[PDB]
Amino acid sequence: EEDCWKNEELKEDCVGPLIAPKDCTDKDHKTYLSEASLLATAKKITQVDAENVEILGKTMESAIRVIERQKTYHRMHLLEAVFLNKHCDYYKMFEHNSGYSQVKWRMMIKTQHFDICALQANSPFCAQCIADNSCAQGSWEFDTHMNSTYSSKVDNFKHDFSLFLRIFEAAFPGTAYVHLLTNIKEKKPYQAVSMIEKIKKKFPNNKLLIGYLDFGKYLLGLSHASTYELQQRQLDKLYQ
Amino acid sequence: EEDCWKNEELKEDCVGPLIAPKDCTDKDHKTYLSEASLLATAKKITQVDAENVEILGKTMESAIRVIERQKTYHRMHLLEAVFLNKHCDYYKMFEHNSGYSQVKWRMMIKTQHFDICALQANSPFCAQCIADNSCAQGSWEFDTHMNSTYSSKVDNFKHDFSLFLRIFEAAFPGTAYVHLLTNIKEKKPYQAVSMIEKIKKKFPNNKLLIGYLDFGKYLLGLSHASTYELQQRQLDKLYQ
Amino acid sequence: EEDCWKNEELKEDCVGPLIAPKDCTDKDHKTYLSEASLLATAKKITQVDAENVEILGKTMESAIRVIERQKTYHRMHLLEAVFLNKHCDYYKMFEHNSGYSQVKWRMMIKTQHFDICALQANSPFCAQCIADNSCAQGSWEFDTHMNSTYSSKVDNFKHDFSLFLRIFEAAFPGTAYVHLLTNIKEKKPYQAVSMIEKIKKKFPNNKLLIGYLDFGKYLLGLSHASTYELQQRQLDKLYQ
Ligand SMILES: *[C@@H]1O[C@H](CO[C@@H]2O[C@@H](C)[C@@H](O)[C@@H](O)[C@@H]2O)[C@@H](O[C@@H]2O[C@H](CO)[C@@H](O)[C@H](O)[C@H]2NC(C)=O)[C@H](O)[C@H]1NC(C)=O
Ligand SMILES: *[C@@H]1O[C@H](CO[C@@H]2O[C@@H](C)[C@@H](O)[C@@H](O)[C@@H]2O)[C@@H](O[C@@H]2O[C@H](CO)[C@@H](O)[C@H](O)[C@H]2NC(C)=O)[C@H](O)[C@H]1NC(C)=O
Ligand SMILES: *[C@@H]1O[C@H](CO[C@@H]2O[C@@H](C)[C@@H](O)[C@@H](O)[C@@H]2O)[C@@H](O[C@@H]2O[C@H](CO)[C@@H](O)[C@H](O)[C@H]2NC(C)=O)[C@H](O)[C@H]1NC(C)=O
Ligand SMILES: [Cl-]
Ligand SMILES: [Cl-]
Ligand SMILES: [Cl-]
């Protein structure tokens, strides 16, 4: 298990989709400040902090912009915990194939396309999951189809890898994306995979999601992932 | 036939997509107030009302927000009739597979996905219409594929049913959505089907549309439709 | 070859996607005014013009709105050349299947659908490229499938043709769209095809793009293209 409050480091068991409540009771009644008052009575946050969560705007897109701005795990986690306690169905919706919290990433995944799916479209991910949206298959042949192709053409690994990141930040802004970026900067891509696997376990029915995630697990295994270097705005998303 | 002006109740023959003009002449010249002046000279509305349609903003998204706000059939129908007389190609575009009035719902249908299509993707709706966008088939097997699956898992009926509503309001905001919601609150889902069928008859070529509509006709037949209860904002969309 | 600066007429070798740099060095450092200062030192533009490119707003959507507003080839080309020198990866992204400069047209192509794909979906474009997104095929059967269908129903040529234009302007706003519109007004559609072919040559890997472009090359061959007449806003996009 994990104590996300005592931890001064981000650990994968503490990223947003793993720490959200599983379900909710009355979302319309709660506000950020009320749920923060509750964390204070729990002795998780101070009364000072709870009165300081007005830093999240009234709107949801704003709250997320603030959360993304944070430069420490303590602050980012506190804001995420208030946020997801007010929107308690936020990651609950990822249990299904639609939802408001999914709009950004589904749109992105169905619009921005990978280069590998263009180069050879025979692989079941491209021709079955991304197109047909089925994704009920547990069996993808990733290696047979894509290994030599990424081996040869490195800039299409660069493109597909950065695309995978853009999508991941649209799905899970905050701690989860920061954890992933961080394992990449350190030149240890595969240590993100553990988190990804735990994410898969939470949303068994989101078939598009599971497919995309398995593809990312794949890209992270490629040697080319350890040679990838981050653009300046990605580096900015990290911690001080 | 129907007299939509004498009616003090919403009837299905009077919902927006059925009452729009079939085609247009010069749309650029007309404004809301001009077409309202014409309804007044027709003795359908009073000169007072015609001078009161500035309540629709200059923009189209605003006019629709106002129309949706109305709490009576008389007012909602009056505003819809002015609106669709200014945008006289509005539902004309639904005769085809593209158009400005379609942007919201097509985007939604291709982005937000149903849970049934994830659970078993073999059914021709999922694997042929939603993915491949063909939908030229008249034959869907809905019962063989989906009956036992919705029977067992009720929360995926809940999700897919609310999704179907979100899409319907994106396609046909106003009277048509209010008529549908109302038949649902009354615990008589299948009485909406008649309207849906008339809608199908108007846009034979919009194959995505016809497919989605047939799916909704299906969901409305399930016992689970009569047990569905509406979230507060849906109830707000109804009439006083 | 072509001298795009001495030319007082728009030629196809001078449209935006053909004249963009192929790649970039440091995009974050440059602004419109800096790259315009560089064109001035090159003796391509006057110092007056370079100090006049503040007419492009700070944002990118605004710069594009201004570029589209221009009523001459000299001005439109000057603004495009500054613009694409600041965003030097703009059409570089079209070498791949994702990117910021692609968001508008991919969204449009996957959301707004053609009438032909609804009428008979057997043709490989509809059932393979638009749906499945593969598009690795060089072989489309366009004639066998679509010739008699557009022959008979003229309003679906009208719809699919205007759709093709809406998409083209989302992909290549500015000179390329103006060149295309112009060849259409003059009742010489097929003279746009040359440009389209050169565009195909620049982005071999963008399979969706190549497919859509081949479809437009097809529509431009149909007699019905020479009978098409432009709506007023299309005519407004042209030159004085
Ligand atoms: C497909 O590729 C993976 C990993 O990619 C390779 O990694 C390097 C060893 C190098 O060969 C690169 O060009 C490739 O991109 C292979 O799996 C890894 O193999 C290494 C070999 O030492 C092993 O140590 C790792 O544990 C393996 N797994 C990883 C990195 O996740 C894999 O074998 C290739 N072939 C098939 C059929 O999958
Ligand atoms: C598939 O389901 C429909 C309706 O769903 C069922 O309705 C209840 C009777 C109950 O069995 C629920 O668990 C199901 O969800 C079936 O069609 C209806 O059957 C009833 C039986 O009394 C009949 O009165 C209705 O008129 C039928 N039609 C409707 C409601 O539109 C249908 O038979 C099932 N099987 C197949 C193969 O379609
Ligand atoms: C499919 O159609 C193209 C062009 O469309 C036809 O053009 C007219 C001649 C008329 O028949 C319209 O109803 C059609 O829409 C055919 O190709 C053209 O044929 C003309 C004949 O004179 C020739 O001059 C052009 O060069 C041809 N190519 C063009 C216009 O790009 C084509 O033959 C038709 N059939 C097949 C199998 O492709
Ligand atoms: Cl979050
Ligand atoms: Cl309406
Ligand atoms: Cl441009």
Numbering used by the authors:
A (entry chain A), B (entry chain A), C (entry chain A): 478 to 717
Sentences from the paper on this structure:
The OBV M segment encodes two glycoproteins, Gn and Gc, derived from a single polyprotein precursor, with Gn encoded upstream of Gc. Compared with other bunyaviruses, OBV Gn is relatively small, with an ectodomain of about 200 amino acids (aa), whereas Gc, with an ectodomain of ca. 900 aa long, is about twice the size of its Gc counterparts from other bunyaviruses. Our structural analysis has revealed that this region is composed of two domains: a 27 -kDa α-helical head domain and a stalk that is divided into two identically folded 19 -kDa tandem β-sandwiches. Furthermore, the head domain is well exposed to the environment and is a major target of the humoral adaptive immune system of the OBV mammalian hosts, indicating that the trigonal pyramid of the spike shields the functionally more critical membrane fusion core machinery from the host’s antibody response.
